Design an enzyme around this catalytic site. Structure first.
Site, PDB file in Angstrom:
ATOM      1  CB  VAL A   1      -0.967  -0.019   1.199  1.00 14.20           C
ATOM      2  CG1 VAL A   1      -1.632   1.334   1.358  1.00 14.20           C
ATOM      3  CG2 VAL A   1      -2.006  -1.106   1.018  1.00 14.20           C
TER       4      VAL A   1
ATOM      5  CB  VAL B   1      -0.450   2.813  -3.963  1.00 14.73           C
ATOM      6  CG1 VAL B   1      -1.478   3.527  -4.825  1.00 14.73           C
ATOM      7  CG2 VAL B   1      -0.352   1.346  -4.344  1.00 14.73           C
TER       8      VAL B   1
ATOM      9  CG  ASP C   1     -12.095  15.573 -45.459  1.00 21.75           C
ATOM     10  OD1 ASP C   1     -12.514  14.645 -46.486  1.00 21.75           O
ATOM     11  OD2 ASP C   1     -12.641  16.655 -45.378  1.00 21.75           O
TER      12      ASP C   1
ATOM     13  CB  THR D   1     -13.963  18.560 -49.685  1.00 27.80           C
ATOM     14  OG1 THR D   1     -13.336  18.119 -50.895  1.00 27.80           O
ATOM     15  CG2 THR D   1     -15.057  19.555 -50.023  1.00 27.80           C
TER      16      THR D   1
ATOM     17  CG  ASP E   1     -15.592  18.912 -43.317  1.00 29.90           C
ATOM     18  OD1 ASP E   1     -14.795  18.135 -43.874  1.00 29.90           O
ATOM     19  OD2 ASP E   1     -16.412  19.605 -43.950  1.00 29.90           O
TER      20      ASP E   1
ATOM     21  CG  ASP F   1     -13.867  13.181 -43.141  1.00 32.57           C
ATOM     22  OD1 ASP F   1     -13.212  12.583 -44.018  1.00 32.57           O
ATOM     23  OD2 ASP F   1     -14.289  14.347 -43.288  1.00 32.57           O
TER      24      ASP F   1
END
Ligand code: PCW
Ligand code: PCW
Ligand code: PCW
Ligand code: PCW
Ligand code: PCW
Ligand code: CLR
Ligand code: UOU
Ligand code: NAG
Ligand code: NAG
Ligand code: NAG
Ligand code: MG
Lengths: 983, 268
Positions: free
Chosen positions: A288, A291, A335, A337, A676, A680
């Site tokens: 413990v 941690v 992309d 366009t 957009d 896509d």
């Protein structure tokens, strides 16, 4: 398919008619059999489910397991009759509280981002024009069924997937569903076998730009192309982020170290006479202890700070983990366009005076203009302004011209905006030339004509302006205007015109021809009744003015953004559904294809040899269309990607975009996708990070993406990359700082168990160190500047360059942490000896020290102590160890500012947040030490001043040692010292 | 990863090099720690502690010490000798260190005043310590009654103050032990005590204590409180306080500071 069928083959498959459509009763039966004509809504996940997800993660699971181990140890100790087990409960409660509060913070971040993104989506019910058993009426689009006869006109959304039956000049916008930037003609004729390229299929959710059409519904709801894309994106699984993978690797390191230390000291405890259950409790305690408690909060706050920095630049992330991915991205699949381009046809090039001029195509008009002094230019501007019928919408003066809204087709809109941006006051100039005759465009003529009257009252001559397809214009026009001279076409102007037209067309641009012809007064006097019915006016022997070409141009910041991304070592790939010529032209324009780069087709054209003769490794650039991509296996695709650094995929379906992204990821790259449109969304979901345009983006793309660019500024990708790299480095520094202090927290407990000294450090003071005093200094390291040109480095290797690695862990734990432990124990023994307990008497003192039945235990001077007095001395030991750790953590935060540079080089005080954090830490330490009631509340004691001084030489040693280490790294690159001691 | 040629991602010679580096680092830091401890121990005074920040008032202990679940708890049966045999044995073992043989290293003291010693005039560079013998406890010394009054239901309790270097209880009058019922029994009278030495005082010549290096033969003065009217078969709480000008017994976090409180039941 249905397009490749005939009207005879149709009208029977759908139990319909071409003229009257469907019967009302049968349409109702079809609407019962199949659902309404609407895409299925995403079921989503509930808010409590999202919160439960926020409570998960690698570090969260480690903390949950640690809390469970605390509870199990508490149960074992209670069963063994042991008391003072409140430490287990405190540790478990702190772990659970940190996990829950961090999850709440992350959920609130996601909720805010979702609200911000959805603040721009608005819904409006749609309608369609249906013909049923003869009657025509406006019905809801959702009630449409397959086989329904529908009519669409300009400005109307296409209400379903429709096979065109009748059409008169019908044009649609397929830029969202497909990648095509130019308006697409819809005619009742099959021109291809695939439904995505034939002219007789209109697509659901697309807009009919102009004209009228009639057709039959062939698909409905999720059966449409857009519905199938939605289904395809639904099946794509979202993978774990690179930062999540790094956190999991680091959690694995912590788990391994915890197990090793616990097992070793379990064996030691068994060897030194402890019982098996006591040794097991020791094991669980050590596990413990390894941690960290506040590290999850620190990481969340650092990611939130980076997200806020991005949001200040209109870049919104949907989750905190997405602020890092661009820093690690090595491949961007973009992309074209609407993402790289403005998705708006604009005037780009002009050919007049035998010269190709370049127009400013940026939406903000921040580029270079062209020469506007020639009388030929004046005539060309007059022609292209007078031969336009588009008009701006009223009440739009203050709106910028490129973003204004005009009533007309794309070509006339672009020409009107060009006139408003070059001539100025386009409609005011038009009204100065009253129109006395006009022939609209028709495919039989392929030209548009209009006769005006000159503005000057002196001149009674009539001007005849004509525009149309360049070949149609040049079949007329037996004269050309060059530098104000009306020379005829002595085949020299014909060959030059053909060359210019071919070059402009090869630039992926649609070209228009413009000419003029002044009408003499003696034969065409004022008041002459021009007649389109009889063609009294001359339509030949005109004076050619110039050629104007059009393209969907890149956004203003896109080329420099692409250049910076390529300078940062990121490969940029174009993936578009548009045509190869336009794709290649735009890729060359934006810098995806560099100057001098050639394809195999380019080399074959240069060398006058067949394409297959060219060596594929001599071509840096490559254009692959979707038809070739279909006939390619993974080996061929990988070979092409490795062979050609500058890759353009054109005419690509959404499935093929997903395939390209998956191939790049399979090669080992972290891939970002920018898009957009709906085409896509599957690639955006598959990508390591998906980036969607805020304004141009569709709902599917914005839902699939992790990052939304609110203002559609593509240059925000560069900021994202830089901030991701910076947050990676700063998280590395912050984690090193946080991990360092864990060793001086655990070593007192190990010594307490093995050597049996009175407990030097309590659980409450450990919790205060973890969650109160060090979180602000650890977070302040997120404000550190880069120590080098971070944007000129290559992307990190995901397999080699981990966030937390062996050199970092070893250094932080076992050199700086070791020094901090030594400082703490020096202060502990000093405070014990000055109060009467010598170190040798301290050795083995624990059972008598903790014996509640011993009220006269003798110290080194023979003085007898009660249990309460010894407990207050133990609290004093807690406090001196705490102050030692705090003083050494000041130096730790100072040395963690840089990994290679000196503190003197970087600047001691240039991080004012860090300075404030140091002051705040010292103030909280003083408050905890000297507030009344602290000894009985949190077991902090008002320690003497000289116990503040004892750890200061150790802090100075930490600073000097780290400075010397970094000097050795800087002075001897590549040496053994750099390989081993650098992190 | 544990490849033969490269053992956990690092060759054998590289492991030797980094291991030697870590050994050198830890040797240097251990040497620095040892030097710090040596400097501390050379600055520590062997006779007087630097500070007494936790020893403002002395603790008070009781003999015989039997502990229940919340403190001292003494229960025995007058008719059953085995119930107080262990108690009397504990008292005998404690008083063994107060025989004349055990006290040969100390001297006669008669001043009734602070024994202030600023020089080392005792054997082997030491200070004189006053002599306290068990016979000063009279009826609670184990002579002539080896039961310390436990057989007769009138038990003796030895009250000892914790010794603190150079602490002065107050010289206006000798510090005195006072024992009473914590909560007065309703029908019964207050606790009747008889003290040895008379009035339950510690002589002022046992103070100051100079530590074990200066007075290795030092013995805490003792006061024996003999209880005389403890009711039979009843649970009672008795608090014995030290009455001195510089001794406080109002510490809510230390019930042994300045006083001792025990639970007592005498069965029949
Ligand atoms: C985000 C989550 C961060 C903090 C929330 C959790 C706080 C710690 C979790 C345990 C809660 C708790 O109950 O913790 C108690 C301790 C002190 O307990 P006490 O001595 O008052 O108990 C008196 C009872 N007796 C006398 C028997 C000992 O408080 C502590 O450790 C406080 C430790 C420092 C916390 C600073 C948090 C700043 C944000
Ligand atoms: C850098 C920023 C500095 C300030 C940060 C925190 C702001 C806190 C400001 C005010 C709160 C303090 C308490 C109210 C003000 C009165 C102060 C006071 O005089 O209070 C006294 C009382 C009773 O004390 P006493 O007379 O028995 O002590 C005897 C002293 N002898 C044992 C030490 C030697 O104390 C009590 O009632 C209870 C006292 C409770 C103290 C805080 C409790 C938890 C609050 C915060 C924890 C996390 C901090 C980080
Ligand atoms: C407190 C703890 C103190 C503990 C000290 C123990 C360590 C003692 C010093 C160890 C020296 C290590 C060393 O000498 O390694 C030499 C290696 C050899 O490399 P190579 O020939 O393969 O390189 C070829 C380069 N290529 C490949 C590009 C051609 O690397 C080099 O030459 C780099 C040259 C040295 C640069 C770093 C400075 C090393 C000094 C370390 C002492 C740090 C603590 C001093 C006290 C501070 C507090 C007062
Ligand atoms: C991974 C590597 C870990 C290495 C850990 C450290 C290893 C070495 C540590 C301890 C071993 C002994 C070395 C230090 C010896 C002390 C130096 C020294 O010469 O002192 C002298 C004293 C004896 O003087 P005296 O009483 O006769 O003088 C009285 C003078 N008059 C009478 C005038 C007041 O000798 C003494 O104290 C002896 C007692 C000293 C030891 C106390 C107990 C230490 C136990 C645990 C501490 C561990 C700390 C670990 C921190 C790092 C973890 C990564
Ligand atoms: C970076 C900016 C920092 C600005 C400073 C922060 C504010 C500090 C100002 C005031 C707080 C302390 C004074 C008021 C409370 C007194 C209570 C009291 O008087 O308790 C006494 C204070 O003990 C002293 O020896 C005096 C200590 C004075 C404070 C020294 C520590 C402050 C040092 C700060 C240095 C910070 C800068 C260095 C680190 C960063 C380097 C870059 C304790 O009692 P006692 O010692 O008699 O023994 C106890 C006996 N028993 C147990 C019976 C009670
Ligand atoms: C022996 C005592 C002094 C402690 C050990 C000192 C250590 C830190 C010193 C002594 C010998 C040194 C090594 C000698 C040989 C090599 C191999 C060479 O390719 C790189 C330097 C390197 C790796 C040195 C590293 C530092 C080193 C290991
Ligand atoms: C970053 N980690 C903080 C941190 C460091 C050091 C620790 O030492 C353990 C420890 C110190 C002081 C008192 C009690 C202690 O353990 C009690 C115990 C805990 C858990 C279990 Cl399962 C069983 C027993 C503990 C936490
Ligand atoms: C101390 O005094 C007592 C009582 O006067 C006496 O009996 C004893 O002999 C003295 N100490 C010695 C000399 O042993
Ligand atoms: C103490 O013992 C004496 C006899 O030596 C006796 O006279 C006296 O009463 C006793 N006092 C008590 C009750 O302790
Ligand atoms: C112990 O005391 C009880 C009264 O509490 C009494 O009845 C019993 O007889 C005593 N023991 C002996 C051995 O007499
Ligand atoms: Mg697009």
């Amino acid at each position: 398919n249905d397009h490749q069928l005939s009207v005879a083959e149709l009208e029977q498959k759908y139990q319909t008619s071409a003229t009257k459509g469907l019967s009302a009763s049968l349409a109702a039966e079809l609407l019962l059999r199949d659902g309404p004509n609407a895409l299925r809504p995403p079921r989503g996940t509930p808010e409590y489910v999202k919160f439960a997800r926020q409570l998960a993660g690698g570090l969260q699971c480690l903390m949950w397991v640690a809390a469970a181990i605390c509870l199990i140890a508490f149960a074992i100790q209670a069963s063994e009759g042991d008391l003072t087990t409140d430490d287990n409960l405190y540790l478990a409660l702190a772990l659970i509280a940190v996990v829950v509060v961090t999850g709440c913070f992350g959920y609130y971040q996601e909720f805010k981002s979702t609200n911000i993104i959805a603040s721009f989506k608005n819904l409006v019910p749609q309608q369609a024009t249906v013909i049923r058993d003869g009657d025509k009426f406006q019905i809801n689009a959702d009630q449409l069924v397959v086989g329904d006869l529908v009519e669409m006109k300009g400005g109307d959304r296409v209400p379903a997937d429709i096979r065109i039956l009748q059409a008169q000049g019908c044009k649609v916008d397929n830029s969202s569903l497909t990648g095509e930037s130019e308006p697409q003609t819809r005619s009742p004729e099959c021109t291809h076998e695939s439904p995505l390229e034939t002219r007789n299929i209109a697509f659901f959710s697309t807009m009919c730009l102009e004209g009228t059409a009639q057709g039959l519904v062939v698909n409905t709801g999720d059966r449409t192309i857009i519905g199938r894309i939605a289904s395809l994106a639904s099946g794509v699984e979202n993978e774990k982020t690179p930062i999540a993978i790094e956190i999991e690797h680091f959690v694995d390191i912590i788990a391994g170290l915890a197990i090793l230390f616990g097992a070793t000291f379990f064996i030691v405890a068994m060897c030194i006479g402890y019982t098996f259950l006591r040794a097991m409790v020791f094991f669980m305690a050590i596990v413990v202890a390894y941690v960290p408690e506040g590290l999850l909060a620190t990481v969340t706050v650092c990611l939130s700070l980076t997200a806020k920095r991005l949001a200040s630049k209109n870049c919104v992330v949907k989750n905190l983990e997405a602020v890092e991915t661009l820093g690690s991205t090595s491949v961007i699949c973009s992309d074209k366009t609407g993402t790289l381009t403005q998705n708006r046809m604009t005037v780009s090039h002009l050919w007049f005076d035998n010269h190709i001029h370049s127009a400013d195509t940026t939406e903000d008009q921040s580029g270079q203009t062209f020469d506007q002094s020639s009388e030929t230019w004046r005539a060309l501007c007059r022609v292209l302004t007078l031969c336009n019928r588009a008009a701006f919408k009223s009440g739009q003066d203050a709106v910028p011209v490129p973003k204004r809204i005009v009533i007309g087709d794309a070509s006339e809109t672009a020409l009107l905006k060009f006139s408003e941006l070059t001539l100025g006051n386009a409609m005011g100039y038009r009204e100065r030339f009253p129109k006395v005759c006009e022939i609209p465009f028709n495919s039989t003529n392929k030209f548009q004509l209009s006769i005006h009257t000159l503005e000057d009252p002196r001149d009674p001559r009539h001007v005849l302006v004509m525009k149309g397809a360049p070949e149609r214009v040049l079949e007329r026009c037996s004269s050309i205007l060059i530098k104000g001279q009306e020379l005829p076409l002595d085949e020299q102007w014909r060959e030059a015109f053909q060359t210019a037209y071919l070059s402009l067309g090869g630039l992926g641009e649609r070209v228009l021809g413009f000419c003029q012809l002044y009408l003499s007064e003696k034969d065409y006097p004022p008041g002459y009744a021009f007649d389109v019915e009889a063609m009294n006016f001359p339509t030949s022997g005109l004076c050619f003015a110039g050629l104007v070409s059009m393209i969907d141009p890149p956004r203003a910041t896109v080329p420099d953004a692409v250049l910076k991304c390529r300078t940062a070592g990121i490969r940029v790939i174009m993936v578009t559904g548009d045509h190869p010529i336009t794709a290649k032209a735009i890729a060359a324009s934006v810098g995806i294809i560099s100057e001098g780069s050639e394809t195999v087709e380019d080399i074959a054209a240069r060398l006058r040899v067949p394409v297959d003769q060219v060596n594929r490794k001599d071509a840096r650039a490559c254009v692959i269309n979707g038809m070739q991509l279909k006939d390619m296996d993974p080996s061929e695709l990988v070979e092409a990607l490795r062979t050609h650094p500058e890759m353009v995929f054109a005419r690509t379906s959404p499935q093929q975009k997903l395939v390209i992204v998956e191939s790049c990821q399979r090669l080992g790259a972290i891939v970002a996708v920018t898009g957009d449109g709906v085409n896509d969304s599957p690639a955006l979901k598959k990508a390591d990070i998906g980036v969607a345009m805020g304004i141009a983006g569709s709902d599917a793309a914005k839902n699939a993406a992790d990052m939304i660019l609110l203002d559609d500024n593509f240059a925000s990708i560069v900021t994202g990359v830089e901030q991701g790299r910076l947050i990676f480095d700063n998280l590395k520094k912050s984690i090193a700082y946080t991990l360092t202090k864990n060793i001086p927290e655990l070593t007192p407990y190990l010594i307490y168990i093995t050597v049996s000294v009175p407990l030097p450090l309590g659980c409450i003071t450990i919790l205060f160190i973890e969650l109160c005093t060090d979180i602000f200094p650890s977070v302040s390291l997120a404000y550190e500047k880069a120590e080098s040109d971070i944007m000129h480095l290559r992307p990190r290797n995901p397999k080699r360059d981990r966030l937390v690695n062996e050199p970092l862990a070893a250094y932080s734990y076992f050199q700086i942490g070791a020094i901090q432990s030594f400082a703490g124990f020096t202060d502990y023994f000093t405070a014990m000896a000055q109060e009467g307990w010598f170190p040798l008497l301290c050795v083995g003192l624990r059972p008598q020290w903790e014996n509640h039945h011993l009220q006269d235990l003798q110290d080194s001077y023979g003085q007898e102590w009660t249990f309460g007095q010894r407990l207050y001395q133990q609290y004093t030991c807690y406090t001196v160890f705490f102050i030692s750790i705090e003083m050494c953590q000041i130096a730790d935060v100072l040395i963690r500012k840089t990994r290679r540079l000196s503190a003197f080089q970087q600047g001691f005080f240039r991080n004012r947040i860090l300075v404030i954090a140091i002051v705040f830490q010292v103030c909280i330490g003083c408050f905890l030490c000297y507030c009344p009631g602290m000894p009985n509340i949190f077991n902090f004691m008002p320690i003497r001043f000289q116990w503040w001084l004892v750890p200061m030489p150790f802090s100075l040693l930490i600073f000097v040692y780290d400075e010397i280490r970094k000097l050795g790294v800087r002075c001897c690159p590549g040496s053994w010292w750099d390989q081993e001691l650098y992190y | 990863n544990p490849d033969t040629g490269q053992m956990l991602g690092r060759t054998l010679s590289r492991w030797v090099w980094i291991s030697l580096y870590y050994v050198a680092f830890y040797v240097v830091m251990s040497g620095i720690f040892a030097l710090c401890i040596y400097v501390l121990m050379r600055t520590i005074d062997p006779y007087t502690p630097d500070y007494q920040d936790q020893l403002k008032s002395p603790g008070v202990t009781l003999r015989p010490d039997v502990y229940g679940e919340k403190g001292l708890d003494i229960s025995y049966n007058v008719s059953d000798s085995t119930t107080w045999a262990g108690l009397a044995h504990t008292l005998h073992r404690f008083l063994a260190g107060y025989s004349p043989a055990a006290q040969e290293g100390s001297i006669n003291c008669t001043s009734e005043k602070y024994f202030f010693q600023e020089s080392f005039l005792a054997p082997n560079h030491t200070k004189f310590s006053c002599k306290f013998t068990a016979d000063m406890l009279q009826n609670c010394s184990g002579r002539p009654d080896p039961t310390f009054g436990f057989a007769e239901g009138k038990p003796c309790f030895i009250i000892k103050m914790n010794r603190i270097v150079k602490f002065l209880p107050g010289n206006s009058t000798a510090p005195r032990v006072d024992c009473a019922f914590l909560d007065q029994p309703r029908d019964g009278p207050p606790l009747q005590v008889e003290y040895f030495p008379a009035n339950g005082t510690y002589s002022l010549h046992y103070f100051p204590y100079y530590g074990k290096k200066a007075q290795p033969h030092y013995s805490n003065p003792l006061v024996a409180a003999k209880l005389l009217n403890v009711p039979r078969n009843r649970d009672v709480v008795i608090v014995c306080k030290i009455l001195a000008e510089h001794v406080s017994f109002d510490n809510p976090h230390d019930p042994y500071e300045g006083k001792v409180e025990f639970k007592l039941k005498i069965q029949k």
